[PDB]
Design a protein around this nucleic acid. Structure first.
Ligand code: SF4
Ligand code: MG
Ligand code: MG
Ligand code: MG
Ligand code: MG
Ligand code: MG
Ligand code: MG
Ligand code: MG
Ligand code: MG
Ligand code: MG
Ligand code: MG
Ligand code: MG
Ligand code: MG
Ligand code: MG
Ligand code: MG
Ligand code: MG
Ligand code: MG
Ligand code: MG
Ligand code: MG
Ligand code: MG
Ligand code: MG
Ligand code: MG
Ligand code: MG
Ligand code: MG
Ligand code: MG
Ligand code: MG
Ligand code: MG
Ligand code: MG
Ligand code: MG
Ligand code: MG
Ligand code: MG
Ligand code: MG
Ligand code: MG
Ligand code: MG
Ligand code: MG
Ligand code: MG
Ligand code: MG
Ligand code: MG
Ligand code: MG
Ligand code: MG
Ligand code: MG
Ligand code: MG
Ligand code: MG
Ligand code: MG
Ligand code: MG
Ligand code: MG
Ligand code: MG
Ligand code: MG
Ligand code: MG
Ligand code: MG
Ligand code: MG
Ligand code: MG
Ligand code: MG
Ligand code: MG
Ligand code: MG
Ligand code: MG
Ligand code: MG
Ligand code: MG
Ligand code: MG
Ligand code: MG
Ligand code: MG
Ligand code: MG
Ligand code: MG
Ligand code: MG
Ligand code: MG
Ligand code: MG
Ligand code: MG
Ligand code: MG
Ligand code: MG
Ligand code: MG
Ligand code: MG
Ligand code: MG
Ligand code: MG
Ligand code: MG
Ligand code: MG
Ligand code: MG
Ligand code: MG
Ligand code: MG
Ligand code: MG
Ligand code: MG
Ligand code: MG
Ligand code: MG
Ligand code: MG
Ligand code: MG
Ligand code: MG
Ligand code: MG
Ligand code: MG
Ligand code: MG
Ligand code: MG
Ligand code: MG
Ligand code: MG
Ligand code: MG
Ligand code: MG
Ligand code: MG
Ligand code: MG
Ligand code: MG
Ligand code: MG
Ligand code: MG
Ligand code: MG
Ligand code: MG
Ligand code: MG
Ligand code: MG
Ligand code: MG
Ligand code: MG
Ligand code: MG
Ligand code: MG
Ligand code: MG
Ligand code: MG
Ligand code: MG
Ligand code: MG
Ligand code: MG
Ligand code: MG
Ligand code: MG
Ligand code: MG
Ligand code: MG
Ligand code: MG
Ligand code: MG
Ligand code: MG
Ligand code: MG
Ligand code: MG
Ligand code: MG
Ligand code: MG
Ligand code: MG
Ligand code: MG
Ligand code: MG
Ligand code: MG
Ligand code: MG
Ligand code: MG
Ligand code: MG
Ligand code: MG
Ligand code: MG
Ligand code: MG
Ligand code: MG
Ligand code: MG
Ligand code: MG
Ligand code: MG
Ligand code: MG
Ligand code: MG
Ligand code: MG
Ligand code: MG
Ligand code: MG
Ligand code: MG
Ligand code: MG
Ligand code: MG
Ligand code: MG
Ligand code: MG
Ligand code: MG
Ligand code: MG
Ligand code: MG
Ligand code: MG
Ligand code: MG
Ligand code: MG
Ligand code: MG
Ligand code: MG
Ligand code: MG
Ligand code: MG
Ligand code: MG
Ligand code: MG
Ligand code: MG
Ligand code: MG
Lengths: 82, 208, 99, 7, 96
RNA sequence: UUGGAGAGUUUGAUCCUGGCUCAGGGUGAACGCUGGCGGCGUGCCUAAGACAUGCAAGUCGUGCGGGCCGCGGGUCCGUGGUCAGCGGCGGACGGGUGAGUAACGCGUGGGUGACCUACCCGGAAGAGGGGGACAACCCGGGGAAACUCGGGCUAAUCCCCCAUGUGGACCCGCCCCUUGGGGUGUGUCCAAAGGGCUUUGCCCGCUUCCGGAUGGGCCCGCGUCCCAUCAGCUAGUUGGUGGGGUAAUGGCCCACCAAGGCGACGACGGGUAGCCGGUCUGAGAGGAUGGCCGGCCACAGGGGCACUGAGACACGGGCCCCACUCCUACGGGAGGCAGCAGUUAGGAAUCUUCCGCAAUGGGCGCAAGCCUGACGGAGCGACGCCGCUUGGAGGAAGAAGCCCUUCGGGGUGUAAACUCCUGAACCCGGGACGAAACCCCCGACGAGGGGACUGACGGUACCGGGGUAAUAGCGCCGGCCAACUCCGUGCCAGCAGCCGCGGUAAUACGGAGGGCGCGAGCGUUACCCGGAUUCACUGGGCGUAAAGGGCGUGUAGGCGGCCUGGGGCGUCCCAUGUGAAAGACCACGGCUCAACCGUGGGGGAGCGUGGGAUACGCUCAGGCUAGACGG
RNA sequence: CCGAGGGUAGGGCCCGUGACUGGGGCGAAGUCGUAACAAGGUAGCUGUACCGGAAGGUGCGGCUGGAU
């Protein structure tokens, strides 16, 4: 399945993820299909999370599956607001 | 690390008075005003005509020994100015001046950059409220360099801030003696500082 | 788009197949001069209606056989045996190149 | 390599 | 030294025999039907041909044949039967 | 318009030519002397040699039947586990390696009316009746073992038939399209599987079909090293027909017929090499390179093979052959570190048999959760880059020692001593960001609320309090090239990158004093680019420096006069698609700075498409006479 | 039927090595002569041919990069 997950960039002890759509069989930091936003878990900058939300819903509509901790960062960005 | 050795021989070689000590630089005990010839057995012999390479090397060692900075950091700064926009001569000087340990000296907190380094290195300094113990910190416009609260009361800083009630400070700088504060106003222009150094001859040294 | 080429026919000696000799021009990547380079394509002539000297267009298509990957798309000119002679003289000059 | 050989 | 690979190997054998048996019948009845189609024997051919067609698509239900394989194999079976019976008489029954 | 330095050496001297040499930057480095700390990186380039031991792929009791075991009783159920078995799904991902491959392998742009895609999403339809097998278990031989044979019982989402046919598949008709695309009509054929709760309904699953999405296969244009002292190559070879085979095109495979296919625009052969984003250098053009990271390919001891399957011809699956090693009770059996550590061999040389699933990610599962040497971290190593220390101020016309001296003196040198100030390490105390989701709660198992548990790194970073003046080495000093004197030596011992030094007054050998340059580094060796405009496209030459073929004739090829028109191939312009991320670059920001890292901005060239321009080059057509040929 | 490979037989290419042999380069102070640079004491060079311890000589033709 196509999924929506965190591809850890950054450096050692300096986590910086990109919320990204990729194939589940692709490697974690591998070639993704599209970037839909970034996420700084350590909250070292005013905007440590950001989601397109329009695109995050397209892939969601066509069958992409978020991760469990990626589902939150799309919830916390209000992707699911009815 | 830094040069850490005898410092009057530097001035005697470079043929120019570099202010690397402190008060002694202004006294008649100054080695330069006492034996203004190069160190060693041959210093009093008659100098033979130097080469063009010698002239450029001598300028570079001059400028570098002024700041007490190692050749690595000296050239990495030089190369940064080469890439950036504008005249490389000024920018290389400005970034040299932007070093914290140079500001702390240029603000009279210490009487020698070599002493200003130990001030920064032992933490007795802060920047914009935060302690900063890195002599290489590139100070930006607007930063408020001050003495550490826990260190405001110390004989060396007082005696230095005392003798600073007298002097004025450069156009690009600001200082409040009573509160031990200081402010970096802007990036120094070329004419805002008169070093005994022809910076083009330092450019030309690296163009080889 | 299926690539479309143009070339003469240098061989009719196969069943339902003709050899189409395409040439192209391009500047030398280093020396700039415009140089010629040619290439033979084995084209599909299922009606066996094309003959020597015909200048034709071929179109990329699914494999008919090994090596056969283009179909003749349309005639363009006819009786250009002057180009065919150029090809044959060259191949003929190869006999004078051995040892 | 039979059987004797030539080499 | 172990695995469930041992198990997956045991299962592969069971499905190997299951697949082989089906394809055997598919080959047998098809030749059988085609043989009659040449003789024609028009009714008996088509009566067999259906049992071929039935077993073919019955294979594409599991992992024995792919859909397009069944289709391809069916296409050539009926295609061969008609052209043989056209050297003979009426098809009589069904499958056409 | 952000970009371009040169020097030594052929001569008595000169100009030129020309080679050699040096100063620069670079590295997965190694070697010598030396060595304090931290960060981020990074580390078998050789034997794709050989490997001891553990670990690197499993999971589901919400599919099924049992053996065992405890839990509540009636040996009956339920239950919890637990162990294999059956049955799912995963094991085709991820991880390693660079041997092979000069290839549609890769790159770049395209084609598929010639194709496939498990789990996911969306829409449509449906799940109705019967039957059956094999393990587990029971019984019997064999063995040191691995282990297996036989006979007999049984369940299921396991196997099979029948029915239903929204639909789908096939042959033949006609319709639209136009390579096998989308329709339609008759005949023919194909579906299913149940389980768990809270039960006139939900939930996880099943079944046929259409579409999406994603991941693939196949095909074509252009590009992709050295040798022509490899010049000819080819019988499934090249095409055709029929057929087999596959998801699918194809000589991919077979039968037959035809005699074709390729090559100086380098076929065939030989050598070397995984390719790319990029990396290094460079004024650029170019050259060199492809380790780490990302993309693709290839391989899994050497080979061949298929099976299972959505997908493999499958690294830790199966069969067979070979080479090797192993255990053995000597009858017989096992193994495949180019997974993570580790051993040995080779080599100048390359790491811990560490910690943890807490985080990201993956498999399975309703979920709890289980597995995860992927991964996150710790360890060793100045391998590299960055940051930091071995103190700071004061301190005599200036100690001792050692060096030079004209014997007056000069030097090391404010250097030390010494005085005061600071306070690396260390000691105490507190102590993290990374972690809020899954889950439970209310609502509706949703949107949205509120709640709880969890950290390997680590008692680490960091903060606070205290607190000692606390490693410096290496190269070089004839010219290039920055830095000079004394002694020893006497073409010796030695130096040396090039020119050259040493023959009894050596700034060139060796030591010393002093001096220059770098600094936990400094040098050396190897190799790459630069200087090298010395393969010259940018940007070179050939009378005598190396260089005009002994001379004609002429094939291919390269090039080609004046005028007019057609086309629009080159060429030029505009729009548009692609040009992944990373990197580089500019801006800002986060680790106290930096290295490192995050966010955003700017794009080209090349190729696909669409539109336009027609001077020049090209082609086609018509005319001319200045080139050329003829009378 | 095909088939890893094993086997028989005969070819081609490449690498290593080989009694002995051929010249080549290099090596402070060896032996022989003096061919070339001056008209270098026979102008030199040259293709070829023959000869000679050795440089070289001679013939035939060519060149001036030949003195006077
Ligand atoms: S100034 Fe006079 S005293 Fe201060 S350092 Fe230069 S020479 Fe020594
Ligand atoms: Mg760390
Ligand atoms: Mg993949
Ligand atoms: Mg740097
Ligand atoms: Mg304090
Ligand atoms: Mg330079
Ligand atoms: Mg049979
Ligand atoms: Mg099927
Ligand atoms: Mg230069
Ligand atoms: Mg020169
Ligand atoms: Mg010389
Ligand atoms: Mg000479
Ligand atoms: Mg000389
Ligand atoms: Mg002369
Ligand atoms: Mg002379
Ligand atoms: Mg010269
Ligand atoms: Mg030269
Ligand atoms: Mg030269
Ligand atoms: Mg170098
Ligand atoms: Mg070392
Ligand atoms: Mg690191
Ligand atoms: Mg480390
Ligand atoms: Mg090894
Ligand atoms: Mg390498
Ligand atoms: Mg290797
Ligand atoms: Mg070996
Ligand atoms: Mg071995
Ligand atoms: Mg484990
Ligand atoms: Mg089941
Ligand atoms: Mg079990
Ligand atoms: Mg992989
Ligand atoms: Mg790895
Ligand atoms: Mg490794
Ligand atoms: Mg790797
Ligand atoms: Mg390789
Ligand atoms: Mg080859
Ligand atoms: Mg070749
Ligand atoms: Mg290719
Ligand atoms: Mg391609
Ligand atoms: Mg492609
Ligand atoms: Mg499957
Ligand atoms: Mg699912
Ligand atoms: Mg039953
Ligand atoms: Mg039964
Ligand atoms: Mg049994
Ligand atoms: Mg036995
Ligand atoms: Mg038994
Ligand atoms: Mg039985
Ligand atoms: Mg009809
Ligand atoms: Mg039925
Ligand atoms: Mg049923
Ligand atoms: Mg292809
Ligand atoms: Mg090609
Ligand atoms: Mg065919
Ligand atoms: Mg073939
Ligand atoms: Mg045949
Ligand atoms: Mg024939
Ligand atoms: Mg060609
Ligand atoms: Mg090879
Ligand atoms: Mg290699
Ligand atoms: Mg290789
Ligand atoms: Mg260049
Ligand atoms: Mg550059
Ligand atoms: Mg390359
Ligand atoms: Mg690589
Ligand atoms: Mg690695
Ligand atoms: Mg890579
Ligand atoms: Mg293999
Ligand atoms: Mg091995
Ligand atoms: Mg094997
Ligand atoms: Mg193999
Ligand atoms: Mg199958
Ligand atoms: Mg494979
Ligand atoms: Mg496997
Ligand atoms: Mg295998
Ligand atoms: Mg293995
Ligand atoms: Mg076996
Ligand atoms: Mg026995
Ligand atoms: Mg045995
Ligand atoms: Mg036996
Ligand atoms: Mg056996
Ligand atoms: Mg075995
Ligand atoms: Mg085996
Ligand atoms: Mg290993
Ligand atoms: Mg090891
Ligand atoms: Mg070893
Ligand atoms: Mg060894
Ligand atoms: Mg490591
Ligand atoms: Mg985990
Ligand atoms: Mg992921
Ligand atoms: Mg997880
Ligand atoms: Mg799940
Ligand atoms: Mg395990
Ligand atoms: Mg572990
Ligand atoms: Mg790791
Ligand atoms: Mg190491
Ligand atoms: Mg270190
Ligand atoms: Mg001092
Ligand atoms: Mg004195
Ligand atoms: Mg003195
Ligand atoms: Mg003294
Ligand atoms: Mg003295
Ligand atoms: Mg936390
Ligand atoms: Mg979960
Ligand atoms: Mg409720
Ligand atoms: Mg503590
Ligand atoms: Mg403290
Ligand atoms: Mg204190
Ligand atoms: Mg104190
Ligand atoms: Mg001290
Ligand atoms: Mg040096
Ligand atoms: Mg000199
Ligand atoms: Mg130098
Ligand atoms: Mg000098
Ligand atoms: Mg003597
Ligand atoms: Mg001696
Ligand atoms: Mg020397
Ligand atoms: Mg050198
Ligand atoms: Mg002497
Ligand atoms: Mg002497
Ligand atoms: Mg002398
Ligand atoms: Mg000397
Ligand atoms: Mg020297
Ligand atoms: Mg010396
Ligand atoms: Mg450092
Ligand atoms: Mg080094
Ligand atoms: Mg340069
Ligand atoms: Mg060049
Ligand atoms: Mg070079
Ligand atoms: Mg050269
Ligand atoms: Mg050359
Ligand atoms: Mg040129
Ligand atoms: Mg030249
Ligand atoms: Mg001539
Ligand atoms: Mg000739
Ligand atoms: Mg011509
Ligand atoms: Mg022309
Ligand atoms: Mg013209
Ligand atoms: Mg055009
Ligand atoms: Mg990019
Ligand atoms: Mg910019
Ligand atoms: Mg660009
Ligand atoms: Mg374009
Ligand atoms: Mg167009
Ligand atoms: Mg055979
Ligand atoms: Mg064979
Ligand atoms: Mg054979
Ligand atoms: Mg065999
Ligand atoms: Mg042989
Ligand atoms: Mg010999
Ligand atoms: Mg003698
Ligand atoms: Mg003579
Ligand atoms: Mg004579
Ligand atoms: Mg003579
Ligand atoms: Mg003579
Ligand atoms: Mg002669
Ligand atoms: Mg004679
Ligand atoms: Mg004569
Ligand atoms: Mg003549
Ligand atoms: Mg004359």
């Amino acid at each position: 399945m196509v999924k929506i997950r965190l591809a850890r960039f950054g450096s050692k002890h300096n986590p910086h993820y990109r919320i990204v759509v990729t194939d589940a069989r692709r490697k974690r930091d591998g070639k993704y299909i599209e970037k839909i936003g970034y996420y700084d878990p350590r909250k070292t900058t005013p905007d440590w999370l950001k989601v397109d939300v329009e695109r995050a819903r397209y892939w969601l509509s066509v069958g992409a599956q978020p991760t469990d901790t990626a589902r939150r960062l799309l919830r916390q960005a209000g992707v699911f607001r009815q | 690390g830094r040069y850490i050795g005898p410092v009057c021989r530097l001035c005697r070689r470079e043929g120019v008075k570099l202010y690397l000590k402190g008060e002694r630089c202004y006294s008649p005990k100054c080695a330069m005003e006492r034996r203004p010839y190069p160190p060693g057995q041959h210093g009093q012999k008659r100098a033979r005509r130097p080469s063009d390479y010698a002239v450029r090397l001598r300028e570079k060692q001059k400028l570098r020994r002024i700041y007490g900075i190692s050749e690595r950091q000296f050239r990495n700064l030089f190369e940064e100015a080469s890439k950036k926009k504008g005249v490389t001569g000024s920018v290389f000087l400005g970034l040299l001046e932007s070093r914290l340990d140079n500001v702390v000296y240029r603000l009279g907190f210490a009487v020698s950059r070599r002493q200003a380094r130990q001030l920064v290195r032992h933490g007795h300094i802060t920047v914009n409220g935060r302690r900063v113990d890195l002599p290489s910190y590139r100070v930006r416009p607007g930063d408020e360099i001050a003495v550490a609260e826990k260190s405001r009361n110390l004989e060396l800083i007082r005696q230095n801030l005392e003798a600073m009630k007298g002097r004025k400070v450069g156009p690009w700088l600001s200082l409040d003696v009573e509160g031990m504060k200081g402010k970096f106003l802007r990036l120094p222009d070329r004419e805002d500082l008169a070093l005994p150094v022809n910076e083009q001859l330092v450019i030309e040294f690296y163009s080889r | 788009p299926k690539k479309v080429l143009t070339g003469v026919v240098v061989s009719d000696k196969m069943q339902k197949t003709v050899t189409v000799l395409v040439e192209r021009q391009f500047p030398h990547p280093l020396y700039g001069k415009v140089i010629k380079r040619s290439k033979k394509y084995l084209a599909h002539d299922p009606e066996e209606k094309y003959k020597l000297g015909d200048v034709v267009e071929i179109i990329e298509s699914r494999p008919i056989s090994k090596r056969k990957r283009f179909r003749v798309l349309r005639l363009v000119e006819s009786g250009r045996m002057d180009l065919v002679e150029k090809y044959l003289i060259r191949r003929q000059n190869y006999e004078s190149l051995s040892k | 390599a039979g059987x004797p050989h030539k080499r | 030294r172990n695995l469930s690979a041992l198990k997956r190997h045991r299962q592969s054998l069971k499905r190997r025999l299951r697949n082989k048996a089906k394809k055997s019948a598919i080959k047998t009845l098809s030749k059988k039907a085609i043989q009659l189609a040449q003789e024609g024997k028009a009714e008996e051919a088509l009566k067999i041909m259906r049992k071929a067609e039935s077993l073919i698509d019955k294979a594409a239900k599991g992992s024995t044949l792919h859909k397009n394989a069944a289709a391809r194999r069916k296409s050539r079976l009926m295609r061969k039967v008609r052209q043989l019976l056209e050297a003979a008489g009426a098809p009589l029954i069904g499958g056409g």
